[PDB]
Design a protein around this ligand. Structure first.
Ligand SMILES: Nc1ncnc2c1ncn2[C@@H]1O[C@H](COP(=O)(O)OP(=O)(O)OP(=O)(O)O)[C@@H](O)[C@H]1O
Ligand SMILES: Nc1ncnc2c1ncn2[C@@H]1O[C@H](COP(=O)(O)OP(=O)(O)OP(=O)(O)O)[C@@H](O)[C@H]1O
Ligand SMILES: Nc1ncnc2c1ncn2[C@@H]1O[C@H](COP(=O)(O)OP(=O)(O)O)[C@@H](O)[C@H]1O
Lengths: 507, 180, 475, 90, 282, 295
């Protein structure tokens, strides 16, 4: 009717009509952008700006479109053109990410090439339900004595590593990663192998590089992948990276494999969500955190599951990590995650400055699964260990009066101190399960009570080498039967007697 | 009151004073029809990619290429200067209503089913002697709750004369349930 | 009526109808979508525009998609066919056992029973727990609250009350989960199929027969939006109102984390355009709760006993949500972390706990006097905490030392090993009757157990176990 | 939500083709008053921190320059200022 | 065209009504011919007199150490589950002897119980406790519960004062007990926030003082020319953690002729009623 | 580009361009008054309008005043000529000794090192102090807190660390004053000129000769507005990244206080209208601290 006039004057009018798949930036700021156009855009859709930057179509207003930029607000200008990718925010998955550091969106950063691609599972998917899920009935060998004994981690669990800074959270995580090497190399069957994902949020890049170097050192990247969203990276990317890791693990969960994700910082994810909300003008709440933080965390943590018999049988554990402030667990975020998780591993600065490392408290650390995430051989020992440690914790208030107290109390204090000095371990030095069972047997059969505390280190080491040199048959019989029968028990007592004979100690 | 109300009052005022009413009325009607028929003029108005100078140039070329007054051009230059061009439609509607209200009202009205030319004539002449407004362009409708008696609303808001069966009946009943 | 989507903001959807609008609370079905997305109308805005809340995720919606008005609110089936079955907020079963072949459907939204149709009769419950049977007796046909933070034993306490009441109830029961762990949901389903509360039978041709069940299940969990979390309790209440209105039966109603019913509103109102209250909560924080609670009431037709778990964020009992909720309860039980850190379980604070069924005209005079004496003792022990922390017990007189001894003894005696805790505690469970609890408390107050130690009362039930444990500990 | 340029005394000029914008950068009209603040339309050219002077002898400081108005703080009481009072720079 | 108003008279005695005078007992309509406006101007300085008559509360510590007169406004402030409703119910129950042993309406004391935010089970329990003692033939109740909308909760205490001004003006006496007077402020906050009015501190508006002053200044003792009536007031307040440094408790303490504090330490030590006679004054 | 001012709200200047808007963080120079004013873009708003934070005061500014776009962010000069000098956030010297005749310039907003260009081998830093090297060993590429005011020997500790690291490791150093007292800056400058950390030798013509020194200085004075106290650590950090990247050295960087960086960030966020976080701090706190500290 009159379009000739606009075509004549504007000189480029006919092209700006198709606003269904292409749009135009209008405003920029605070990681948010406003576009005019893109009427056929889906919510949560991935969007591609002019200069290669990307974003998520978060809000679809009546005329404008509100977009979140996965980057810094310098590669985006008012006037820039915007396209539709036609798909929801997605990330690659499968084998090919193993041994690979990646950003939130599967883009590599270690400088070794591109990453192959499956059908690019989505990110904010819904968790499973009640029928395909299954209860947890098998362990996840972490390699820490106190954990595998008193706070056992299952296969299908969601357990929290909570503690102040410089307490050994990344250390627990990396020992849990390194211990899976022998189990994976010895099996060659993905139904028994356990993969892993390590998500860094707000973490120092040098620390991430050191972690990756220590894993390549110890050959612990054949079965792990890493997802880095560091302090310099944007807030949307920190908000994403956990979901990208969980989407990478959903492949194993749905393919019958087993896996474990370690979100090394969730408080930074929550800080970034608070940031995005306050920059989106949303109304703050308790500690300025919005109300969608519980939903934010539970969307992510409710995916960790043990699939059932008809859904393949796979599994996906989850070891989220939380930093506190002066040991306060009555705060908002710790309680929000404790109301989501099935356990707790607590870490202290008192024990970490004294020297007890790993500084895993045992009165505050718990586990809902419990004995069902143990083997019978380790049940039979860790039960007695937990009982004796409870007794020692009870009666340690009056330890200075040990001379005034009965022989029973002094024996309890001696056994408890021996166990406490036996739960100690070095950095980057896990232990097999049979070795753990042997050591805790030695500990709970009074073989360490008369022995001096400081000797228990070299004692333990020598004993380990002994049973790794002579009694390999015992070790394999334990690893096979998953039980301490009377025959293996007598063999082990004989070996312990031969060791205390052949070796000299302070007491 | 509102923004479109402000511009519509200003335009109705000035076009009644100086240029004429009918000219600006036809101009606004033509613009509204081009907006609802072209389907790209609307996007030209809404889009922010168009610069203010291209906007004014296309608006002046529409002025020259079409039967167009200076008052409407000044309106468009003002709306562009103040970022109010999308309110052209609303403004046009506001301009439309006042003139037809000045001249003659349109009224709603309800029956049960099709009445006859006889009682239709009676209804219109009775409502005309009631209004004493020489121009009346009405509506017919069919809602059967008011059983058959002719209910209506002569459109000025503060007169909804409820000549109906069921309504008078229920009001009477609720009156005569009074105590003693 | 058909409508179009115009705008989408998270869990909120703005829709435009042409001819005729739907009223508020009505349900709308989205058509150009993978799953069955349902929207519940909340507001009207003008321009024939309507605001709605989505019962699922909005990822995939388009400005232009089509919506159909069902003409009525959400409808959940009712009958004896919902028994022994799980049902989400929209009534769809997620048990993977077939559809729900129920004749009649009820609306999620119903007006509460009137003033005249109420019946406040004082009864008691046999929970088997000492603390509540003594100091906070539970009211048959009334509301009960378990207030607590995170990790204090609300879910464990509810599972114990289920084991000790529902199995010994005979009538019907319902369990709602509003943001609880799917793990414990599956665990409850399997424990019910074990204990016979749910009696599932696999007919040939893949059919099922839940005949014999005595518990319904409604689950809107943490993996759900706020709109799908703020409308589950109403579904469960409809399911129970069917029983206690038509069937005339007495029902139980366990609810897990009612706090989410508020949290959802708090993460929705900001998107609905409402001004936030003190801590970001709603201005409708009291009415949205009262319209839920007033449907829970004993009447002349039937009875609802109710057991609600109330979260306490940041261990702050002065929050507006629990503050409002305190006014609506007939019995109360406040769990504490200071008491849980001592290893006492159930970690009930008997001073913040209270009830209306403790008066001498309901429970006897010996019960009343024992309870009040215990409260006096525990308050007198609370009053010495500061001076004990600073100076020590040696400063105290002998009356105060006797008070401290008996208070620690009755603290440790008000602890009970449950049956559901055997998996991570090992020790078997201990049901405890009321006259036994009362005799034991009477003796501990009189002084017939001062000779015993303090750790002999820990997890023993009655006093015969305590004396046997003191004997064995003498060795 | 309306701007001072959009009021229905100025739009009666703009619609009428009046181009009497020869009102200099020195003079402006008060638009709103309250609590020691005034809001003017015009004075495109006034500096931030500059002194301005009202009809009735009083003076004020221009602080919040804006795209559509100018914000002024008064060295006195608001009973003197009202209804499009002329404001001139110094 | 009507400003919001409610019926008044002796037809309310023995009946239970909502915020607007509509009965909910389920037995009959309200036989009252005279109405009265809800929001009204309190009586001024001249048509008043000093307080010289006592209001027998039935308790001992109150009647001895914190006495209450006819024309007073005494606050009952404490924590939850401390004996606030029980104090008021005993004040109500003590009057049946005083009223049975006379036919002088100038000496009988009628009663009004406004319940804001309460649940219908609790209100029914209270009505049952009163019927069991024949303590309803001189009382009325105004139940604006939680399911009842915010405006009804907001209007109920003004409706009670309107029902009591009939006694105050007609030479008779009266007592009115506002129960959960904080739910009124909650409802006002709710209304103003859904009407987009801007808040103050604790998200309340600034008109809370003018919300409570209007209400409590209607309690008064009139002179011998205006009949000689009286309207006593006994508001009730629930504090949190004993915090009386808050806004609503502070306002109501600052606009009352006394205080009756109630504590849980004293409630559990064995002192019931748990009245602290140090902080409590008159 | 060339634009015009449209409004002035304290230290927040809104500017309008006709075409080819500048990106965010770019620099803009005001034209038409003394005391050269520079505005850093921070936000786009529509209508071809942008928002900017000023590095100096806004008194005497006019609407419609002309503005030029430099086409890049604040660019500080770098080189061995910046040794011994003092510089403000915009690279200008404030020591009254001449201009910085450097052959290069670096932006103050630079991306951090990637994951590939990072050393996995940690190593100590040989300071030369006994208690330090014994009980609190420093690290290369590390960040060391220093809790202490005056009356303790902090300035002397600083100068000794500088001198020893320059003698042994051959590395240069940088000192950033984030909202410091002016007399304190004067004292530090004269103490350096006394102790030999700076070598300011006069020349015959009347110029100065900043010969072999061991520390550059970047000062954002207290009298400067927020935005300078916020982009000073970044200025010094780019000055140090020059030595790290190109010269290939192990350098130092002393920061007079890191709390004033946060003060300035919170101020800037309040001016720009961002809703403050828990204790008034901005919502971009950890993000900005990471943008700083990951370099
Ligand atoms: N079992 C251990 N044995 C020896 N050294 C240990 C042990 N655990 C931790 N350390 C030391 O504690 C320091 C911190 O290590 P780690 O990175 O694991 O802490 P973190 O929990 O990640 O703290 P943050 O995340 O706040 O940096 C390291 O210097 C480490 O060498
Ligand atoms: N003199 C008393 N003697 C025995 N018991 C009492 C006495 N006074 C109060 N109680 C008890 O105090 C409890 C609360 O009763 P009441 O109805 O007064 O609640 P309240 O103080 O109004 O607080 P709330 O309404 O918030 O629950 C009841 O358990 C009651 O039995
Ligand atoms: N009867 C009990 N005896 C000993 N410990 C218990 C008992 N019940 C719970 N605990 C502890 O309570 C904690 C979990 O309680 P639960 O109510 O499920 O958590 P939440 O309140 O977050 O839902 C576990 O650590 C569990 O070991």
């Amino acid at each position: 009717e009159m379009s000739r006039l606009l075509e004549e004057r504007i000189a480029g009018w006919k092209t700006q009509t198709s606003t269904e798949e292409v749009g135009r930036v209008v405003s920029v700021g605070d990681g948010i952008a406003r576009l005019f156009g893109l009427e056929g855009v889906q919510a949560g859709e991935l969007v591609e700006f002019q200069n290669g930057m990307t974003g998520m179509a978060l809000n679809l207003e009546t005329d404008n479109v509100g977009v979140v930029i996965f980057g810094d607000d310098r590669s985006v200008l008012e006037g820039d053109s915007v396209k539709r990718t036609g798909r929801i925010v997605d990330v690659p998955i499968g084998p090919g990410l193993l041994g690979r550091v990646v950003d939130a969106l599967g883009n590599p950063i270690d400088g070794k090439g591109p990453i192959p691609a499956k059908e690019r599972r989505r990110v904010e998917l819904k968790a499973p339900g009640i029928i395909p899920r299954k209860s947890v009935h098998e362990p996840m060998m972490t390699g820490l004595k106190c954990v595998d004994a008193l706070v056992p981690v299952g296969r299908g669990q969601r357990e929290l590593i909570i503690g102040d800074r410089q307490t050994g959270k990344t250390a627990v995580a990396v020992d849990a990663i390194i211990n899976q090497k022998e189990i994976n190399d010895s099996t060659d069957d993905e139904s028994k192998k356990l993969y892993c994902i390590y998500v860094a949020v707000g973490q120092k890049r040098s620390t991430v590089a050191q972690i990756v170097k220590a894993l390549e050192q110890r050959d612990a990247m054949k079965y792990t992948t890493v997802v880095a969203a560091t302090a310099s990276e944007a807030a949307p990317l920190q908000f994403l990276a956990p979901y990208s890791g969980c989407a990478m693990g959903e492949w194993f969960r749905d393919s019958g494999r087993h896996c474990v994700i370690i979100y090394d910082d969730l408080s930074k994810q929550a800080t970034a969500y608070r940031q995005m909300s306050l920059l989106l003008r949303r109304p703050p709440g308790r500690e300025a955190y919005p109300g969608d933080v519980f939903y934010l965390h539970s969307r992510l943590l409710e995916r960790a599951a043990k699939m059932g018999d008809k859904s393949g049988g796979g599994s996906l554990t989850a070891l989220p990590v939380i930093e506190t402030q002066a040991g306060d667990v009555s705060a908002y975020i710790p309680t929000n995650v404790i109301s989501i998780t099935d356990g707790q591993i607590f870490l202290e600065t008192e024990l970490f400055y004294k020297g007890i490392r790993p500084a895993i408290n045992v009165g505050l650390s718990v586990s809902r699964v419990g004995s069902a995430a143990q083997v019978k051989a380790m049940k039979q020992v860790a039960g007695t260990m937990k009982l004796e440690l409870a007794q020692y914790r009870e009666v340690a208030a009056f330890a200075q009066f040990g001379s005034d107290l009965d022989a029973s109390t002094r024996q309890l204090l001696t056994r408890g101190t021996a166990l406490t000095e036996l739960l100690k371990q070095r950095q980057y030095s896990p232990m097999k399960n049979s070795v753990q069972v042997c050591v805790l047997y030695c500990g709970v059969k009074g073989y360490l009570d008369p022995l001096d505390p400081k000797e228990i280190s070299r004692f333990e080491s020598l004993f380990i080498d002994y049973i790794n040199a002579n009694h390999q048959d015992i070790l394999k019989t334990i690893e096979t039967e998953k039980e301490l029968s009377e025959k293996t028990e007598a063999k082990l007592r004989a070996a312990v007697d031969e060791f205390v004979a052949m070796n000299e100690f302070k007491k | 009151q509102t923004l479109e109300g402000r511009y519509a009052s200003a335009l109705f005022r000035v076009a009644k004073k100086k240029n004429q009413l009918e000219k600006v009325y036809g101009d606004l009607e033509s613009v509204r029809n081009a907006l609802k028929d072209s389907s790209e003029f609307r996007l030209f108005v809404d889009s922010p990619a168009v610069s203010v100078q291209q906007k004014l140039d296309v608006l002046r070329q529409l002025v020259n290429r079409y039967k167009f007054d200076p008052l409407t051009g000044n309106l468009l230059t003002t709306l562009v200067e103040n970022k109010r061009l999308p309110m052209l439609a609303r403004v046009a509607d506001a301009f439309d209503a006042m003139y037809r209200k000045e001249k003659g009202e349109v009224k709603c009205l309800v029956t049960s089913a099709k009445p006859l030319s006889a009682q239709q004539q009676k209804e219109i002449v009775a409502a005309l002697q009631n209004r004493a407004g020489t121009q009346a362009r009405l509506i017919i409708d069919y809602a059967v709750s008011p059983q058959i008696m002719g209910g209506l609303v002569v459109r000025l808001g503060e007169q909804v004369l409820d000549f109906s069966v069921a309504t008078r009946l229920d009001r009477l009943q609720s009156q005569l349930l009074a105590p003693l | 009526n058909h409508g179009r989507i115009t705008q989408v903001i998270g869990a909120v959807v703005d829709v435009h109808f042409d001819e005729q609008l739907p009223p508020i609370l009505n349900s709308l079905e989205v058509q150009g979508h993978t799953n069955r997305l349902v929207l519940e109308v909340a507001q009207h805005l003008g321009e024939n525009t309507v605001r709605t809340i989505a019962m699922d995720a909005t990822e995939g919606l388009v400005r232009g998609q089509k919506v159909v008005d069902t003409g009525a609110p959400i409808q959940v089936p009712v009958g004896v066919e919902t028994l022994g079955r799980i049902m989400n907020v929209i009534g769809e079963p997620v048990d993977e056992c077939g559809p729900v072949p129920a004749k009649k459907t009820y609306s999620i939204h119903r007006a509460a029973p009137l003033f005249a149709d109420q019946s406040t009769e004082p009864g008691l419950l046999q929970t088997g727990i000492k603390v509540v049977d003594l100091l906070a007796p539970y009211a048959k046909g009334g509301k009960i609250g378990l207030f607590g933070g995170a990790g204090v034993g609300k879910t464990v306490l509810i599972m114990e009350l289920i084991n000790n009441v529902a199995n010994k109830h005979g009538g019907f029961s319902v369990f709602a989960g509003v943001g609880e762990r799917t793990r414990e949901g599956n665990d409850l389903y399997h424990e019910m199929m074990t204990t016979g509360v749910i009696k599932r039978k696999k007919l040939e041709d893949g059919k099922f027969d839940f005949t014999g069940s005595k518990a319904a299940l409604v689950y809107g969990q943490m993996n759900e939006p706020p709109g799908a979390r703020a409308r589950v309790a109403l579904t469960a209440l409809s399911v129970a109102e069917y029983f206690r209105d038509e069937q005339g039966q007495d029902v139980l109603l366990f609810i897990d984390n009612i706090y989410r019913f508020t949290q959802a509103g708090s993460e929705v109102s900001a998107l609905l355009g409402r001004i936030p209250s003190a801590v970001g909560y709603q201005p409708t924080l009291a009415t949205d709760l009262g319209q839920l609670q007033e449907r829970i009431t004993t009447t002349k037709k039937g009875s609802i006993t109710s057991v609600q778990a109330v979260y306490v964020p940041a261990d702050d009992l002065t929050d507006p949500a629990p503050a409002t909720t305190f006014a609506h309860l007939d019995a109360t039980t406040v769990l504490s972390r200071q008491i849980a850190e001592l290893g006492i379980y159930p970690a009930v604070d008997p001073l913040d706990s209270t009830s209306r069924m403790l008066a001498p005209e309901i429970v006897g005079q010996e019960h009343y006097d024992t309870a009040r004496a215990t409260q006096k003792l525990l308050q007198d022990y609370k009053s010495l905490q500061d001076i004990i922390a600073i100076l020590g017990m040696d400063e105290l007189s002998e009356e105060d030392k006797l008070v401290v001894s008996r208070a620690r003894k009755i603290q440790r005696f008000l602890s009970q090993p449950f049956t559901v805790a055997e998996v991570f505690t090992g020790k078997p469970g201990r049901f405890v009757e009321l006259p036994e609890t009362i005799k034991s408390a009477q003796t501990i107050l009189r002084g017939e157990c001062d000779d015993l130690p303090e750790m002999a009362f820990y997890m023993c039930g009655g006093l015969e176990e305590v004396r046997s444990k003191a004997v064995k500990m003498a060795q | 939500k309306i701007s001072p340029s959009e009021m229905s005394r100025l739009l009666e000029e703009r619609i009428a083709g009046w181009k009497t914008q020869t009102s200099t950068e020195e003079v402006g009209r008060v638009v709103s008053v309250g609590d020691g603040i005034a809001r003017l339309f015009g004075l495109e050219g006034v500096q931030a921190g500059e002194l301005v002077e009202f009809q009735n002898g009083m003076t004020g400081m221009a602080l919040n320059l804006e795209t559509d108005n100018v914000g002024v703080v008064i060295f006195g009481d608001d009973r003197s200022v009202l209804e499009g009072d002329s404001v001139k720079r110094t």
